[PDB]
Amino acid sequence: QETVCIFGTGDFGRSLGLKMLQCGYSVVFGSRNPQKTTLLPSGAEVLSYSEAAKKSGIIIIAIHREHYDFLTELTEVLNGKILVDISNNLKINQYPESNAEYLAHLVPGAHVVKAFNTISAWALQSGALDASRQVFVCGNDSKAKQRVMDIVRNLGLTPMDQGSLMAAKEIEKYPLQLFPMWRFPFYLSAVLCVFLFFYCVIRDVIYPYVYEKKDNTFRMAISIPNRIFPITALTLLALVYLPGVIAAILQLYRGTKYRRFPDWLDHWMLCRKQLGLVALGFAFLHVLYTLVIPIRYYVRWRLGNLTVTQAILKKENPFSTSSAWLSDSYVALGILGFFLFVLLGITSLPSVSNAVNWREFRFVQSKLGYLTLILCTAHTLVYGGKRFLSPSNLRWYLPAAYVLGLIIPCTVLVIKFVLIMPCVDNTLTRIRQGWE
Amino acid sequence: QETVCIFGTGDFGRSLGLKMLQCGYSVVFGSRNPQKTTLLPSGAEVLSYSEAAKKSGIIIIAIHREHYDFLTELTEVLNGKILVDISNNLKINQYPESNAEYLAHLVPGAHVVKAFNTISAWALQSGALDASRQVFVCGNDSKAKQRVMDIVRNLGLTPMDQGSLMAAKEIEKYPLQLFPMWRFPFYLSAVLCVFLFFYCVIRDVIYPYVYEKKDNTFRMAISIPNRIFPITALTLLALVYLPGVIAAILQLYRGTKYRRFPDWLDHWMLCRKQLGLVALGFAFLHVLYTLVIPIRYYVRWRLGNLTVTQAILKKENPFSTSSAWLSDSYVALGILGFFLFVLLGITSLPSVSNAVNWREFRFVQSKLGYLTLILCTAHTLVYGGKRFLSPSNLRWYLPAAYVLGLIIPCTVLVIKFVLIMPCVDNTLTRIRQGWE
Amino acid sequence: QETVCIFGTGDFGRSLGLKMLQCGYSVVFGSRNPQKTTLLPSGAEVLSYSEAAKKSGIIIIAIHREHYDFLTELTEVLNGKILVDISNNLKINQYPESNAEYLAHLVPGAHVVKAFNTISAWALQSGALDASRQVFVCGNDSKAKQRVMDIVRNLGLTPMDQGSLMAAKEIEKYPLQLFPMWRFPFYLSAVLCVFLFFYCVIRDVIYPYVYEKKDNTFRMAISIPNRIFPITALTLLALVYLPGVIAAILQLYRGTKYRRFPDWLDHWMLCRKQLGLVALGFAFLHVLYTLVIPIRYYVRWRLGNLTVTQAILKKENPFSTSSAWLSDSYVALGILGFFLFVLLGITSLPSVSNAVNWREFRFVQSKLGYLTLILCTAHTLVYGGKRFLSPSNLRWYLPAAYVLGLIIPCTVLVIKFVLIMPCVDNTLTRIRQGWE
Ligand SMILES: Cc1cc2nc3c(=O)[nH]c(=O)nc-3n(C[C@H](O)[C@H](O)[C@H](O)COP(=O)(O)OP(=O)(O)OC[C@H]3O[C@@H](n4cnc5c(N)ncnc54)[C@H](O)[C@@H]3O)c2cc1C
Ligand SMILES: Cc1cc2nc3c(=O)[nH]c(=O)nc-3n(C[C@H](O)[C@H](O)[C@H](O)COP(=O)(O)OP(=O)(O)OC[C@H]3O[C@@H](n4cnc5c(N)ncnc54)[C@H](O)[C@@H]3O)c2cc1C
Ligand SMILES: Cc1cc2nc3c(=O)[nH]c(=O)nc-3n(C[C@H](O)[C@H](O)[C@H](O)COP(=O)(O)OP(=O)(O)OC[C@H]3O[C@@H](n4cnc5c(N)ncnc54)[C@H](O)[C@@H]3O)c2cc1C
Ligand SMILES: NC(=O)c1ccc[n+]([C@@H]2O[C@H](COP(=O)([O-])OP(=O)(O)OC[C@H]3O[C@@H](n4cnc5c(N)ncnc54)[C@H](OP(=O)(O)O)[C@@H]3O)[C@@H](O)[C@H]2O)c1
Ligand SMILES: NC(=O)c1ccc[n+]([C@@H]2O[C@H](COP(=O)([O-])OP(=O)(O)OC[C@H]3O[C@@H](n4cnc5c(N)ncnc54)[C@H](OP(=O)(O)O)[C@@H]3O)[C@@H](O)[C@H]2O)c1
Ligand SMILES: NC(=O)c1ccc[n+]([C@@H]2O[C@H](COP(=O)([O-])OP(=O)(O)OC[C@H]3O[C@@H](n4cnc5c(N)ncnc54)[C@H](OP(=O)(O)O)[C@@H]3O)[C@@H](O)[C@H]2O)c1
Ligand code: HEM
Ligand code: HEM
Ligand code: HEM
Ligand SMILES: CCCCCC(=O)OC[C@H](COP(=O)(O)O)OC(=O)CCCCC
Ligand SMILES: CCCCCC(=O)OC[C@H](COP(=O)(O)O)OC(=O)CCCCC
Ligand SMILES: CCCCCC(=O)OC[C@H](COP(=O)(O)O)OC(=O)CCCCC
Ligand SMILES: *[C@@H]1O[C@H](CO)[C@@H](O)[C@H](O)[C@H]1NC(C)=O
Ligand SMILES: *[C@@H]1O[C@H](CO)[C@@H](O)[C@H](O)[C@H]1NC(C)=O
Ligand SMILES: *[C@@H]1O[C@H](CO)[C@@H](O)[C@H](O)[C@H]1NC(C)=O
């Protein structure tokens, strides 16, 4: 039976130790005071730091970074041991080197393996290890690195190796972030959802309050969110394929592909996926508000008054078959536009994305990507034909609130149509392999 | 070219052997009778047990547990061999030790590796290995364990290592279960779906049969399932966050977190995920019945009679703008409540859950979890305002059938609101790190 | 610090080298001309082929297959080196042996490891490695194979080992295909979608143009796609479980299970999953056209004319409660039929499929699979009861266009009902273990 020593008897050291008592390991705690250790598991003795290190071959330091100073007092004991640095930091970039780098310079005669810093001690005690399933392992001594990965499987966890010790800077950044790449699409949507909210409140509850003075203020329950959400969903969709357009152009002015993109497009290259999933969220709301239109009391009432007026006044509707096209046109364009818009999202799962080579993935995300962007653009152009862009439409001096959202996608579709022309596209073909 | 011996020529031994003939291995079968072996692949000879063991270094025993007795007659031949125990059992807990433990005590001079017990022989023959893709490997001799994992990759499979031989008790439990954790939410929903079915049949087809005697019995096609399913979906949602409430309280009476939960809450801690996915199933039905309301003939007819009555009788509806709030209120609360209720389900995928650290996962599942539970509670409270809880509502002595489903969630929301108060929440903060 | 040599300085060699400069490796390029090398990273010298090979231990050949000829001129330099063949081919089956096999016969005194052939050089430069995340590694020398997998983790990638060098034929087929298994369901659906399109155009816009001459040509916007898509979705669903029926029968005529299926059923065994996901796509469209019926102008108008006619003519509808069953019957059958039809798709994810043993997977895909096929068949039979199959239905000599899609599923349901009978099913039980 193996023997595993743990320095520090605090929060993580109790929880990790009590897991290993249930997994068959001689757990030998080391604390500052072997006299008084109140909360401890049953079959695990507590010794001194110099005492407990002389018994195991695997030593886990469950202490913070600042209290590393006593380890230099015992570096002749730690010769050839396997030290498992598990520590984290309070915030990103607090120190110029990582802990495992800093731990290796404190004890040069021992092998350092970064591990366990992802999971939480409450997940070990409660056993509800759901997101804390993988354990990242990085280090330099490969033979000692395997012995750590023989422990982690016996804890019911999953070891994911991360290579050399140079990756330990990245791994400590991992459990401290809270949606780092989603910060740009959240702020970009929220500044566009608030602005479009106050834009449409002016058209739809203020203008009926100034002229033909009636309340009409229920519109911000469903109808104004049914106007904010799809234009948010359309603009963020057009913002996805816009760096693909710009960097295509920006390769032409340079005439090569070996120079660096100007670092503001480059973060906006990495946030392509982050935008498209946000655009999926708003389009899914625009679906659900639309399918629930015939339950709304304002829809039920207006269909009542329009019918009874046609009932008591003997005039009738002649069934204009032109309008029978259009009202069935954009809907059928919207469903085809939405189905692909789901199909891009199902591709975005990290398990579907790992089962598909990059040629098929380029076919889904780029060849079918514009095909979504067309059918979403045609869904609002055909709906725009019923409004026809008349001068009887703008209320004071400002339009019907969707044509502001049509500036961006029509810009992309025209310029992409330039880039498919053989006067340009054959130049694109040679420049993807090397050109002056 | 390597040589792989297989003891037993039955069901699995033919299928595993015929796979290895297509993968380039000298397959040497051993049976009881090398004379008569009718069904066998082409390039694989059949020898005796003592004969075939003297040729390979890797020996696979495709025999049941009870017919292990002849192996003691040849334990001097199996010195240093690699024995791959693949056997399963008829039911859980049939024997006090696992097979690989029991096999190691029969032959102490050989290394045991548990493998292959997950996949099926028909998946090997037909090549439609879809769910039988991973192969679990556990054992003690690490160098022999790698040589087994060099075979499994050559079969087009995926080796998942499981650590020491102590995990072999768990691995044989794996292919024998049939949704073990889903057993509690199935029974809890079914006893709540049947009870709520007979509860609403009494209100909706019995009471129109006693008083104002008319048929009205079509309601159990859609309308009664549109009443069973969301209250089932709401109660099972409130049952998710209820152990989080109770164990928060139960940490306060103890004043520490280092004592064990009382073993009936603990299984109901592990079945949190299992409930929430079932609540996603019923809420998704309550969506689809609701969106298809305007196609129902009973909905089309009642809208006809209400209009024609307003047509021939010249009275009209004055468009009560208070009702224009409420009917657009709970719908907009329901869509926001459903969108997050999907977003918890997309998080529950085992690939999305492995790409997210536990801080973000706690933010989705717990910070946004109650935010779903509020908006689902407000979706039925606002719908409850249209019924107003009047004495003209209960039929005999029993209410309008949703307020029975409001006992559980409002209980959770009040007590959780207690736990966010700083008179309690600051005590929660110190007790998550250690306290008397 | 390690030293990694790269033969060839072209497209991939620049991109792979510039990644390794950012990851800490002495990159030593070899080209034909060390004099003129214009585009190169900063800290990486360019030497001759014989010169650069004398410095590293790991040599990557970023050259095509045809320009392998100079390697025989320097095979005494490559003794014991680790050669990483990364090359691809222009099309499948261009040569009888793979590159790594062909490379090993050119240099017998070196170890060959196939790697890196999946990812693209633009993903390395741009850093948007999304689908090009995994790197497949296969080879024979296991100790040299690990040293390659120590490089790949330092590039931020994920090494997936593939076993011996015999798998290298398969790996080069991987990045060249473009949905290979989806080719059969695409063509089978498209030949069934076009045929059913021209079939229903004749019934629905031609017959109103011949008799009772009116336009009626808007029907091919939504209504004709609402007739093509579900019958496409139903037939492709019945085509899923049809090989399961036929091969069950075909085991009975043989009386064993150890003979090979006749190679046209066998490809149609592997394309089970490929069909069912396509049938999920068309059923999801038939959902979305159906839920958007009450927004169509043709639906709004016909409900207007039917009401006003019932308004001015004092006759009324007596609320036939038989029709109140049926219109609420097939809808409730369709929703139950669709919910399971989603639940089969959620199972089809490669991460959910790897978390479920084959007994539960057989219970979802086969026990609940027919339960979908029943409820989808009953969804159109009950809708067929409203049309009743009258002689007042067929227009010239041809029926109401869905009963053509009912030939296949009712065939499967009857013959499967034969196979559950104990006169047959007990014979099925013995024949799955061995029988004459
Ligand atoms: C719902 C949704 C989900 C999404 N999910 C994802 C996701 O998971 N991951 C993701 O990455 N994106 C995702 N996206 C974003 C979108 O799919 C990406 O833009 C897509 O990956 C590629 O689109 P593209 O037109 O930019 O093609 P790209 O190929 O990325 O861009 C074209 C340009 O890239 C350059 N380029 C491309 N290939 C080469 C080459 N071989 N050599 C030289 N230059 C080259 C050229 O400048 C070319 O003009 C998603 C979008 C949506 C709406
Ligand atoms: C659709 C859906 C999907 C779901 N999917 C999942 C899923 O995949 N996985 C899953 O696990 N659940 C899942 N759930 C359940 C739900 O998300 C869980 O309750 C969630 O994981 C945590 O919720 P909680 O309020 O119980 O938070 P918790 O943190 O689990 O519970 C709070 C209590 O836990 C204790 N506690 C928590 N952290 C600490 C700590 N650091 N120290 C000491 N005590 C602590 C305290 O007593 C605290 O009061 C799902 C639910 C739904 C509706
Ligand atoms: C939405 C959707 C998704 C799907 N996803 C998938 C998917 O991911 N993967 C997939 O494979 N299919 C998938 N399918 C197809 C369908 O689920 C398959 O048919 C299913 O895997 C098994 O169905 P089956 O009736 O053919 O059962 P099977 O068991 O495959 O077929 C029955 C016949 O197989 C033979 N057989 C089965 N077991 C044995 C045995 N032990 N010994 C001897 N003979 C045996 C017998 O001849 C038996 O009569 C999907 C279908 C749909 C509609
Ligand atoms: N959920 C978690 O809390 C969690 C999860 C994963 C990783 N970690 C990491 O575990 C490490 C330990 O943090 P923790 O949360 O578990 O708290 P902690 O262990 O209770 O506090 C740090 C420990 O350091 C010990 N120690 C020795 N000398 C000390 C000194 N001069 N001053 C203070 N402490 C001294 C203390 O125990 P003794 O005096 O008895 O030796 C003390 O218990 C951290 O680096 C953390 O990143 C924590
Ligand atoms: N789908 C599957 O069936 C499957 C899948 C995975 C694993 N397994 C496991 O494979 C093992 C073998 O089961 P199986 O399904 O493949 O059936 P089986 O091999 O046909 O029956 C067991 C084998 O034991 C051999 N044997 C030797 N002495 C025997 C004796 N006295 N009595 C009976 N049999 C004797 C028999 O072949 P010989 O007499 O010629 O030696 C017989 O073929 C089981 O443990 C099972 O858990 C089965
Ligand atoms: N996206 C990709 O392009 C990609 C991705 C992955 C893998 N690959 C693979 O990388 C390999 C190289 O293809 P590549 O795309 O990167 O193009 P490439 O390297 O630019 O062209 C092949 C290289 O071979 C070198 N070479 C030496 N003698 C040569 C000769 N007589 N004739 C022609 N070239 C000679 C050339 O550089 P020097 O003369 O200076 O030596 C030339 O750069 C291919 O096998 C490809 O499958 C390519
Ligand atoms: C489920 C399929 C869809 C249906 C049935 C649908 C239906 C509609 C309807 C009926 C309208 C007019 C709303 C009104 O009368 O005020 C509309 C507007 C709109 N839809 Fe869609 N839509 C769908 C999907 C999409 C998608 C995928 C997009 C693109 C993201 C989109 C973008 C828009 C936009 C921009 C508007 C204009 C908003 C406005 O002017 O108020 N829709 N949609
Ligand atoms: C798609 C979004 C949703 C819509 C449009 C919606 C709509 C409705 C409607 C119209 C009703 C009244 C049904 C009737 O008149 O008989 C209702 C009832 C109800 N909904 Fe929802 N709902 C949605 C989502 C949810 C969610 C997520 C929950 C919570 C799980 C929920 C729980 C309920 C409950 C409990 C009732 C009361 C059932 C009854 O009293 O008969 N709904 N919903
Ligand atoms: C969301 C649930 C579903 C609903 C509400 C639904 C509703 C309907 C409706 C109303 C019709 C008649 C359309 C018309 O009047 O022209 C119909 C037809 C049909 N549905 Fe569904 N359906 C659903 C799901 C399914 C599923 C899962 C299938 C099987 C793949 C299916 C197959 C069919 C077929 C074959 C027809 C006949 C097409 C025709 O004759 O024109 N449906 N469905
Ligand atoms: C408040 C919004 C939070 C959303 C969190 C989320 O779902 O994404 C978590 C992660 C994304 O994390 P990164 O890939 O690391 O950016 O999973 C996915 O890839 C999305 C797949 C989803 C495809 C349907
Ligand atoms: C009859 C109901 C059967 C449902 C089976 C199922 O889907 O769950 C299988 C598994 C659950 O298995 P366990 O995690 O082991 O409990 O996959 C998931 O995590 C659910 C992800 C799904 C998230 C959408
Ligand atoms: C034009 C249609 C293209 C569809 C591509 C696609 O989604 O499948 C890609 C892959 C399928 O690839 P193979 O399994 O290799 O056939 O992922 C899935 O398993 C489907 C899971 C999806 C379950 C919802
Ligand atoms: C219909 O609405 C108008 C205002 O739009 C109103 O004046 C009229 O009275 C209504 N007709 C009814 C309620 O019959
Ligand atoms: C209703 O439709 C018929 C034809 O189907 C038409 O002749 C009649 O005029 C319509 N009634 C109206 C518009 O009131
Ligand atoms: C409307 O319904 C009532 C019963 O609710 C019925 O008596 C009346 O005849 C109906 N009106 C019609 C059909 O015009």
mmCIF file of N, CA and C in Angstrom, chain B residues 11 14 118 125 130-131 133 153-154 174-175 177-179 217-218 221-222 288-289 291 294-297 300-301 350-351, chain C residues 161 163-164 257-258 261 290-291 294 303 307 317 319 321 323 325 327-328 332 335-336 351 353-354 356-361:
data_model
loop_
_atom_site.group_PDB
_atom_site.id
_atom_site.type_symbol
_atom_site.label_atom_id
_atom_site.label_comp_id
_atom_site.label_asym_id
_atom_site.label_seq_id
_atom_site.Cartn_x
_atom_site.Cartn_y
_atom_site.Cartn_z
ATOM 1 N N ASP B 11 -18.796 -17.476 -27.932
ATOM 2 C CA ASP B 11 -19.392 -16.313 -28.576
ATOM 3 C C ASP B 11 -18.369 -15.204 -28.761
ATOM 4 N N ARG B 14 -14.817 -16.069 -30.866
ATOM 5 C CA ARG B 14 -14.847 -16.014 -32.319
ATOM 6 C C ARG B 14 -14.821 -14.579 -32.810
ATOM 7 N N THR B 118 -16.796 -4.224 -21.574
ATOM 8 C CA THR B 118 -17.860 -3.291 -21.910
ATOM 9 C C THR B 118 -18.483 -3.610 -23.256
ATOM 10 N N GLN B 125 -18.409 -7.867 -34.636
ATOM 11 C CA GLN B 125 -18.639 -8.510 -35.919
ATOM 12 C C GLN B 125 -19.252 -7.545 -36.919
ATOM 13 N N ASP B 130 -20.902 1.714 -31.794
ATOM 14 C CA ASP B 130 -21.277 3.093 -31.544
ATOM 15 C C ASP B 130 -21.195 3.444 -30.066
ATOM 16 N N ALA B 131 -21.959 2.768 -29.221
ATOM 17 C CA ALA B 131 -21.833 3.030 -27.797
ATOM 18 C C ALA B 131 -20.692 2.252 -27.183
ATOM 19 N N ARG B 133 -17.541 2.018 -27.737
ATOM 20 C CA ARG B 133 -16.354 2.624 -28.313
ATOM 21 C C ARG B 133 -15.194 2.636 -27.334
ATOM 22 N N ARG B 153 -5.936 -0.001 -29.288
ATOM 23 C CA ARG B 153 -5.897 1.016 -30.325
ATOM 24 C C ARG B 153 -5.831 0.398 -31.709
ATOM 25 N N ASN B 154 -5.250 -0.791 -31.828
ATOM 26 C CA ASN B 154 -5.185 -1.445 -33.124
ATOM 27 C C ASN B 154 -6.505 -2.081 -33.518
ATOM 28 N N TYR B 174 -20.615 -1.486 -14.329
ATOM 29 C CA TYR B 174 -20.922 -0.547 -15.408
ATOM 30 C C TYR B 174 -21.807 -1.129 -16.512
ATOM 31 N N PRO B 175 -21.491 -2.248 -17.174
ATOM 32 C CA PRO B 175 -22.339 -2.666 -18.290
ATOM 33 C C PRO B 175 -23.602 -3.400 -17.880
ATOM 34 N N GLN B 177 -25.946 -2.145 -15.449
ATOM 35 C CA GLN B 177 -27.013 -1.249 -15.047
ATOM 36 C C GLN B 177 -27.804 -0.771 -16.251
ATOM 37 N N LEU B 178 -29.001 -0.268 -15.979
ATOM 38 C CA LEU B 178 -29.870 0.283 -17.011
ATOM 39 C C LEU B 178 -30.522 1.513 -16.400
ATOM 40 N N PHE B 179 -29.872 2.664 -16.572
ATOM 41 C CA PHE B 179 -30.218 3.956 -15.992
ATOM 42 C C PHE B 179 -30.379 3.857 -14.484
ATOM 43 N N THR B 217 -65.251 15.621 -23.032
ATOM 44 C CA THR B 217 -64.327 14.568 -22.632
ATOM 45 C C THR B 217 -63.092 14.498 -23.509
ATOM 46 N N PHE B 218 -62.994 15.361 -24.504
ATOM 47 C CA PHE B 218 -61.815 15.509 -25.338
ATOM 48 C C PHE B 218 -60.669 16.207 -24.628
ATOM 49 N N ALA B 221 -57.047 14.906 -24.199
ATOM 50 C CA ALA B 221 -56.159 14.748 -25.338
ATOM 51 C C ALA B 221 -54.969 15.692 -25.236
ATOM 52 N N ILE B 222 -55.232 16.985 -25.096
ATOM 53 C CA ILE B 222 -54.177 17.986 -25.036
ATOM 54 C C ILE B 222 -54.267 18.772 -23.739
ATOM 55 N N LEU B 288 -44.531 22.671 -26.329
ATOM 56 C CA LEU B 288 -45.059 22.232 -27.611
ATOM 57 C C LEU B 288 -46.564 22.087 -27.603
ATOM 58 N N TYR B 289 -47.172 21.809 -26.456
ATOM 59 C CA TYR B 289 -48.622 21.881 -26.423
ATOM 60 C C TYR B 289 -49.103 23.314 -26.493
ATOM 61 N N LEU B 291 -47.601 26.055 -27.991
ATOM 62 C CA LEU B 291 -47.427 26.645 -29.307
ATOM 63 C C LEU B 291 -48.375 26.080 -30.349
ATOM 64 N N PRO B 294 -53.239 27.243 -31.217
ATOM 65 C CA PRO B 294 -54.095 27.808 -32.268
ATOM 66 C C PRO B 294 -54.365 26.896 -33.454
ATOM 67 N N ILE B 295 -54.015 25.620 -33.390
ATOM 68 C CA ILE B 295 -54.372 24.684 -34.442
ATOM 69 C C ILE B 295 -55.495 23.762 -33.981
ATOM 70 N N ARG B 296 -55.714 23.653 -32.675
ATOM 71 C CA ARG B 296 -56.736 22.790 -32.108
ATOM 72 C C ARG B 296 -58.129 23.204 -32.560
ATOM 73 N N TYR B 297 -58.952 22.206 -32.884
ATOM 74 C CA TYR B 297 -60.300 22.488 -33.362
ATOM 75 C C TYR B 297 -61.160 23.097 -32.270
ATOM 76 N N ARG B 300 -60.214 26.665 -32.383
ATOM 77 C CA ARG B 300 -60.758 27.310 -33.573
ATOM 78 C C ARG B 300 -62.254 27.513 -33.451
ATOM 79 N N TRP B 301 -62.942 26.572 -32.816
ATOM 80 C CA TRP B 301 -64.387 26.684 -32.723
ATOM 81 C C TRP B 301 -64.794 27.745 -31.718
ATOM 82 N N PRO B 350 -21.954 16.300 -21.254
ATOM 83 C CA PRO B 350 -20.663 15.932 -20.670
ATOM 84 C C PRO B 350 -19.469 16.521 -21.385
ATOM 85 N N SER B 351 -19.652 17.142 -22.540
ATOM 86 C CA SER B 351 -18.540 17.818 -23.176
ATOM 87 C C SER B 351 -18.520 19.300 -22.862
ATOM 88 N N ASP C 161 -3.583 8.913 -29.906
ATOM 89 C CA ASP C 161 -2.780 7.844 -30.466
ATOM 90 C C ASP C 161 -3.666 6.895 -31.257
ATOM 91 N N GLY C 163 -2.309 3.693 -32.500
ATOM 92 C CA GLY C 163 -1.803 2.338 -32.521
ATOM 93 C C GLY C 163 -0.607 2.131 -33.417
ATOM 94 N N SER C 164 -0.592 1.018 -34.139
ATOM 95 C CA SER C 164 0.569 0.654 -34.929
ATOM 96 C C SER C 164 0.610 1.462 -36.217
ATOM 97 N N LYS C 257 -25.850 -17.022 -37.487
ATOM 98 C CA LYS C 257 -25.471 -15.621 -37.557
ATOM 99 C C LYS C 257 -24.022 -15.428 -37.965
ATOM 100 N N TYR C 258 -23.342 -16.493 -38.362
ATOM 101 C CA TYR C 258 -21.919 -16.440 -38.639
ATOM 102 C C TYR C 258 -21.605 -16.287 -40.117
ATOM 103 N N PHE C 261 -23.401 -10.688 -44.287
ATOM 104 C CA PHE C 261 -24.510 -10.014 -44.937
ATOM 105 C C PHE C 261 -24.107 -9.600 -46.350
ATOM 106 N N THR C 290 -45.500 23.909 -39.137
ATOM 107 C CA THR C 290 -46.803 23.686 -38.540
ATOM 108 C C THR C 290 -47.107 24.712 -37.468
ATOM 109 N N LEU C 291 -46.128 25.024 -36.623
ATOM 110 C CA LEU C 291 -46.334 25.997 -35.563
ATOM 111 C C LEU C 291 -46.524 27.412 -36.076
ATOM 112 N N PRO C 294 -50.694 29.601 -37.970
ATOM 113 C CA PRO C 294 -51.621 30.703 -37.681
ATOM 114 C C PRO C 294 -51.079 32.100 -37.936
ATOM 115 N N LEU C 303 -59.898 31.849 -42.336
ATOM 116 C CA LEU C 303 -60.625 31.939 -41.078
ATOM 117 C C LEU C 303 -61.516 33.164 -41.045
ATOM 118 N N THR C 307 -65.791 32.691 -41.022
ATOM 119 C CA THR C 307 -66.531 33.261 -39.909
ATOM 120 C C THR C 307 -67.608 34.221 -40.388
ATOM 121 N N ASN C 317 -72.290 26.047 -36.497
ATOM 122 C CA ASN C 317 -71.668 24.746 -36.358
ATOM 123 C C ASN C 317 -72.100 24.131 -35.043
ATOM 124 N N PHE C 319 -70.704 21.952 -33.151
ATOM 125 C CA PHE C 319 -69.569 21.445 -32.372
ATOM 126 C C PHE C 319 -69.594 19.915 -32.312
ATOM 127 N N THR C 321 -68.442 16.650 -31.630
ATOM 128 C CA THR C 321 -67.436 16.246 -30.658
ATOM 129 C C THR C 321 -66.608 15.076 -31.162
ATOM 130 N N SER C 323 -65.142 15.242 -34.163
ATOM 131 C CA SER C 323 -64.018 15.964 -34.744
ATOM 132 C C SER C 323 -63.151 16.597 -33.667
ATOM 133 N N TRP C 325 -62.292 15.012 -31.022
ATOM 134 C CA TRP C 325 -61.306 13.981 -30.736
ATOM 135 C C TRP C 325 -60.161 14.037 -31.716
ATOM 136 N N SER C 327 -58.954 15.999 -34.217
ATOM 137 C CA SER C 327 -58.045 17.126 -34.358
ATOM 138 C C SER C 327 -57.181 17.306 -33.120
ATOM 139 N N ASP C 328 -57.639 16.823 -31.970
ATOM 140 C CA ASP C 328 -56.754 16.784 -30.816
ATOM 141 C C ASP C 328 -56.105 15.421 -30.667
ATOM 142 N N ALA C 332 -51.623 15.372 -30.446
ATOM 143 C CA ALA C 332 -51.031 14.809 -29.241
ATOM 144 C C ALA C 332 -50.209 13.573 -29.559
ATOM 145 N N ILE C 335 -46.776 15.219 -31.027
ATOM 146 C CA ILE C 335 -45.865 15.783 -30.046
ATOM 147 C C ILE C 335 -45.127 14.698 -29.283
ATOM 148 N N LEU C 336 -45.834 13.648 -28.867
ATOM 149 C CA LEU C 336 -45.166 12.495 -28.278
ATOM 150 C C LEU C 336 -44.256 11.823 -29.287
ATOM 151 N N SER C 351 -20.613 12.599 -27.412
ATOM 152 C CA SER C 351 -20.271 12.609 -26.002
ATOM 153 C C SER C 351 -21.332 11.938 -25.154
ATOM 154 N N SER C 353 -23.126 9.512 -26.372
ATOM 155 C CA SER C 353 -23.004 8.117 -26.767
ATOM 156 C C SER C 353 -21.845 7.431 -26.062
ATOM 157 N N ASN C 354 -20.868 8.197 -25.588
ATOM 158 C CA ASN C 354 -19.740 7.572 -24.912
ATOM 159 C C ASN C 354 -19.963 7.500 -23.410
ATOM 160 N N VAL C 356 -22.774 6.080 -22.115
ATOM 161 C CA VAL C 356 -23.912 5.178 -21.990
ATOM 162 C C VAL C 356 -23.508 3.813 -22.525
ATOM 163 N N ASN C 357 -23.644 2.778 -21.697
ATOM 164 C CA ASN C 357 -23.344 1.419 -22.126
ATOM 165 C C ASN C 357 -24.368 0.930 -23.144
ATOM 166 N N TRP C 358 -24.028 -0.164 -23.820
ATOM 167 C CA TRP C 358 -24.814 -0.585 -24.970
ATOM 168 C C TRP C 358 -26.171 -1.153 -24.601
ATOM 169 N N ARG C 359 -26.405 -1.524 -23.349
ATOM 170 C CA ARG C 359 -27.745 -1.975 -23.010
ATOM 171 C C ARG C 359 -28.722 -0.820 -22.956
ATOM 172 N N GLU C 360 -28.325 0.281 -22.327
ATOM 173 C CA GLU C 360 -29.180 1.454 -22.295
ATOM 174 C C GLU C 360 -29.301 2.078 -23.668
ATOM 175 N N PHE C 361 -28.231 2.022 -24.452
ATOM 176 C CA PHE C 361 -28.257 2.575 -25.793
ATOM 177 C C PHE C 361 -29.161 1.766 -26.696
#
